[PDB]
Amino acid sequence: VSSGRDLNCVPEIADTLGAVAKQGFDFLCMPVFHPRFKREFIQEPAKNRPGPQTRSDLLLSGRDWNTLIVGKLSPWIRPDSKVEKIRRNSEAAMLQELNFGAYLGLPAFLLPLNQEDNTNLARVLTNHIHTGHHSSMFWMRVPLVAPEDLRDDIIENAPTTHTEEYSGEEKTWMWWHNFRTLCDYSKRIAVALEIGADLPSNHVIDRWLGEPIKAAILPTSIFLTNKKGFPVLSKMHQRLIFRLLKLEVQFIITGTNHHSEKEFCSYLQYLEYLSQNRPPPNAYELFAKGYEDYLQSPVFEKDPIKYSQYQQAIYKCLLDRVPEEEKDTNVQVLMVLGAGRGPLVNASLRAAKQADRRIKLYAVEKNPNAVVTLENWQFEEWGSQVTVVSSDMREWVAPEKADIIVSELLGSFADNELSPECLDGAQHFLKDDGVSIPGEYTSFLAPISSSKLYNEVRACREKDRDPEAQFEMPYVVRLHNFHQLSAPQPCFTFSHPNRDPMIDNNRYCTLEFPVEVNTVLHGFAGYFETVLYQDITLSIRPETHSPGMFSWFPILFPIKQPITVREGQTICVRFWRCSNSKKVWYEWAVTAPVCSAIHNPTGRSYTIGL
Amino acid sequence: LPPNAPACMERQLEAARYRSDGALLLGASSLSGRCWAGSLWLFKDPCAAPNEGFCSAGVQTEAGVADLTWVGERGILVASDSGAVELWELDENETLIVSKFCKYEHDDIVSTVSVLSSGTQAVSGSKDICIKVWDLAQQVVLSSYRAHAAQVTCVAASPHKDSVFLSCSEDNRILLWDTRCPKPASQIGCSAPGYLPTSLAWHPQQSEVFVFGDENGTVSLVDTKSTSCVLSSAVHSQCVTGLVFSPHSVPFLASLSEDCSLAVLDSSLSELFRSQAHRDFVRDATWSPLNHSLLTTVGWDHQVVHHVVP
Ligand SMILES: COc1ccc([C@@]2([C@]34C[C@H]5C[C@H](C[C@H](C5)C3)C4)N=C(N)N(C)C2=O)cc1
């Protein structure tokens, strides 16, 4: 566990850092200038105060400042104070403390969010960020519950607000939201979430899903005392620690030792005890460990579950097409479209031996690089049973019509998004009673909230192209720090073979998503369900997800501008699957609660080459 | 200088308290440099201050001193940055200052301390938003109160009532306390929530009236029973850090501020005396019990000024 110690009192910088390192802390959160040292910059004679203003930078090595010390803004600095004199002094002091932090080369600086108005605090910080490009981080100290809603009910004439306040309990998230909106979603500004004695309602903690949390501040006061006499945490407090550990945040310990009979190391020992006693990561979690939240613009042989289903689908199709009395006289002609390296071809052969039936295989692949792998396979192992087809399928005439056409939906050798158009142009060399594998597939859409992902898409602005083209294109992404706002609904379905007189792959779907929580819409997550044969299916939809299928990740359709969504409101999405004669593209827009621009019109930012 | 005492005194002087015999207690803290520690000093000769070589007693604390208060005639209550309330007992010969107890109970810097009328109990206000009632005999915390929403700026014990004390914080709240009530805190509010309260001072004779200074430099005279402001004056141009009454039968009010100036006011809050002697923030002020016309002030400029109020 990466952890740090928060101290507002450091008399000897060399001795204090050595003491916290002995306890097992990786870093130290300390003030760069004395917290009580109130400076004057405008009024005399306090303006001409003889120096130094703080401790020398030579008291620690450059390596120690860059890895072991996290900056802390002085508590007296109030840039949004109602007094003009305090406002101007805090402005000059904030710059003085921030510039000193950059002079030391600190990896992170702590600034507090303890009120509704932090506009001038945002203005001064944004100016410091735009004055020379740097990698220095800024951790915003925000509690889960405001201290006004945390106070003891001991004031006689002014008692605590006992009434229900759904939006009032989420006021702390709005302090952070308004601040980062003012700073124009800067990647250098993160959340240092402070956990109160009594946790708020689950909906308040759910607002922080998809937020850039880099630190978790845990005070000594929230720690309970066990039967032995050691610092522990409640089951509800432990639940949040397991959630925060998955987000890979840096847990910070603040306040004096309340369990005085045991040293500060006991507080850290419990956090390291929780990480060693957490639920084990599954095959899906262990596969994509470094691929978390990293979005790629639109490995496969390493998934055995995927081809096991294809093998079972062909095995079930063969038995249903040829009875036990015809297991030698009737030969089933199978056509593998987009054969690639031959995993679907091998799965087709394994199924024939399992069903004990006669098969004639045709490995179709346009990519000549993959044809080398197939032709080496059909000479060293397969033989006369498999006939590799590298010719242009539109010109090439089949010796006989196929019984079963087997293909993959997504893959490096598959046609991915162009699966309907390619299967429609392949059903001509298929028999009248012919079966297609997969026979059917449905796409699913779900509204998501992720301020972290929106900022990652925002960072994808490239030169020599539209400055908003990054929002008008889908992304393959491992959905980690995000929040699904509503249950995924079916968008469009395709069936193969399609014996329709007028085959049109153009689609237009309208989906209404009911949202029972206050949130901010950042985009839409795309999933899919596919029927290979009868009950045998493959799915990336979280509800019906195929166990151990890491080969396919969900797609993401982002929106140029985020949309505020209230409790009870409905998100209405309009999706278009557009198909021309030369290209195919996706167009999307939001109509409720507010209207958005039609994304990717005429496929200007994204198009799949037909 | 006496044994155990440090060779040099910290530049920033935070507290100056006159003992009933005439001796002066000094609280210095290091707010800049290599070491950010604090120190406690005693001067039987007030004119000898701030010179280290001519002092009665001296000692160095682990961290800087934020506030100080006399515990009878030999005890010294310390509000430390370490988040601990320290009690330093004076020697039988009054030459050494020994540490009786150091309890780390406040999560942040203890900014203000006030001994309750009995002299066996004391109250502490810290940046951790908490207020604690301490027992000076058993060295423990009797009650831990969290009524405020921001850092507790000032705590002032009632002159003769033990259960009664005042507390103010950056949440614009002035609370009148009474440990005899199930709900001890009572928000003694004004007609309009103006500027943040910074200093508190109980009246010595009238146990029902008090004075408070705000961050805008205004000092207000407020009665507890009337629960509304009747008289106030713009005394300073910057935050009022302290307010101290004289030992007179009809006391004079000494106002301290960050504008580096001292001010002495009457019952109608009108100015009588003003001193620009300090070139830095005026921290503490104490009237001599021997000479009621004499007033000693300290600041961050390492100056110990002795004034003669007319
Ligand atoms: C609502 O618009 C969407 C657009 C594309 C998709 C899908 C496919 C995959 C597959 C089956 C479906 C048809 C074709 C082929 C596209 C969905 N494309 C990718 N890369 N993913 C992961 C999908 O699920 C999903 C939703």
Task: Provide a compact summary of the structure.
The complex is a heterodimer of chains A (610) and B (310). With 610 residues, chain A is of the alpha/beta class. Chain A contains 14 helices and 26 strands.
Structure overview:
Chain A: Residues 438-610 are annotated as: Beta barrel. Chain A: It is an enzyme of class 2 (transferase). Chain A: A protein binds at residues 300, 408, 417. The complex is a heterodimer of chains A (610) and B (310). Chain A has helices at 13-23, 62-67, 84-104, 119-130, 171-182, 202-205, 235-246, 265-276, 283-287, 304-321, 343-355, 368-380, 419-424, 451-458, and strands at 3-6, 27-29, 69-72, 108-112, 137-143, 189-194, 213-219, 224-225, 231-232, 250-254, 295-296, 331-337, 358-364, 386-389, 402-407, 430-437, 440-448, 475-477, 489-495, 507-514, 519-533, 536-539, 555-565, 570-579, 583-592, 608-609. By secondary structure, chain A is of the alpha/beta class. By secondary structure, chain B is mainly beta. Chain B has one domain. In chain B, a hairpin with a 7-residue loop joins strand 15 and strand 16. Chain B has a 4-stranded antiparallel sheet, with no helix packed on it. In chain B, strands 5-6-7-8 form a 4-stranded antiparallel sheet, with no helix packed on it. Chain B has a 4-stranded antiparallel sheet with strand order 9-10-11-12, with no helix packed on it. Chain B is globular and about 55 Å long. Bound molecules: ligand QL1.
